[PDB]
Amino acid sequence: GDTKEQRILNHVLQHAEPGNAQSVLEAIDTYCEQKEWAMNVGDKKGKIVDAVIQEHQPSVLLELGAYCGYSAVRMARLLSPGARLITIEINPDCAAITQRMVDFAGVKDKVTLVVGASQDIIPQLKKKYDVDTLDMVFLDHWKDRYLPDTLLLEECGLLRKGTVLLADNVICPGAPDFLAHVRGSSCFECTHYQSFLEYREVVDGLEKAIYKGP
Ligand SMILES: Nc1ncnc2c1ncn2[C@@H]1O[C@H](C[C@@H](N)CC[C@H](N)C(=O)O)[C@@H](O)[C@H]1O
Ligand SMILES: O=[N+]([O-])c1cc(O)c(O)c([N+](=O)[O-])c1
Numbered sequence: 037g038d039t040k041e042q043r044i045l046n047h048v049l050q051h052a053e054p055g056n057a058q059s060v061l062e063a064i065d066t067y068c069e070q071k072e073w074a075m076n077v078g079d080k081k082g083k084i085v086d087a088v089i090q091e092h093q094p095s096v097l098l099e100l101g102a103y104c105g106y107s108a109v110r111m112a113r114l115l116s117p118g119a120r121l122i123t124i125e126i127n128p129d130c131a132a133i134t135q136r137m138v139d140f141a142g143v144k145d146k147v148t149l150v151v152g153a154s155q156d157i158i159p160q161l162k163k164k165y166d167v168d169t170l171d172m173v174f175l176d177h178w179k180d181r182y183l184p185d186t187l188l189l190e191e192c193g194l195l196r197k198g199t200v201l202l203a204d205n206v207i208c209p210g211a212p213d214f215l216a217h218v219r220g221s222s223c224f225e226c227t228h229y230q231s232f233l234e235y236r237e238v239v240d241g242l243e244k245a246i247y248k249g250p
């Protein structure tokens with residue numbers, strides 16, 4: 037008598053340690069491996085996300101698509117006080133799960149969750165969320181929004197030289213229009229990490245695209 041996202045949260049509440057981000061991630065990944073698949077970036081691709089954050093040291097991050105909060109918890113746990121991870125989530129029930137997950141994980145002081153569609157919120161970031169430019173963007177929402185939101189981020193002046201875009205699922209389910217754009221454009225320098233779809237033995241990959249300036 038509940039939703040899958042509630043079942044994931046409840047599993048965390050009963051199995052993970054309050055305030056322990058590692059333990060929250062482990063409980064989510066265990067539940068989704070063993071009981072019900074869900075579209076979290078997961079532990080194998082999450083290790084690649086962690087390495088990108090360690091390599092580029094962002095302190096202002098934007099996430100597109102929060103779902104149950106797995107990736108927000110994963111990324112926020114690596115950030116130091118004063119860092120900001122702004123996450124945009126269009127589905128208000130998912131947003132409600134994400135806020136509870138972030139709170140339980142102990143990272144709420146680093147996370148600003150915004151309910152709404154990325155295309156509506158992105159142009160408000162500078163004036164309403166006190167953003168200058170972004171250090172890193174994690175794209176993980178509906179894949180047909182990757183390219184339009186990348187273009188919007190650029191038009192809105194949110195990318196500086198050196199901003200890191202990191203996109204999940206560029207192979208499966210796929211983001212070919214986004215890939216063709218960033219790989220063909222002199223405005224980006226791209227790296228591809230081959231990996232696997234979360235919780236499955238199916239090939240996937242992430243693309244890192246560094247903005248070079250207009
Ligand atoms: N235009 C959009 N703006 C914001 N969120 C969106 C949009 N389109 C889809 N979403 C949400 O994107 C999320 C997609 C998930 N794959 C996110 C997973 C999350 N990044 C994680 O790894 O834990 C869902 O919760 C969607 O409701
Ligand atoms: O269908 N899937 O396998 C996925 C996987 C994912 O990792 C997703 O992020 C996704 N989505 O946001 O639509 C869908």
Ligand SMILES: [Mg+2]
Pocket residue numbers: 075076077176204205
């Ligand atoms: Mg994904």
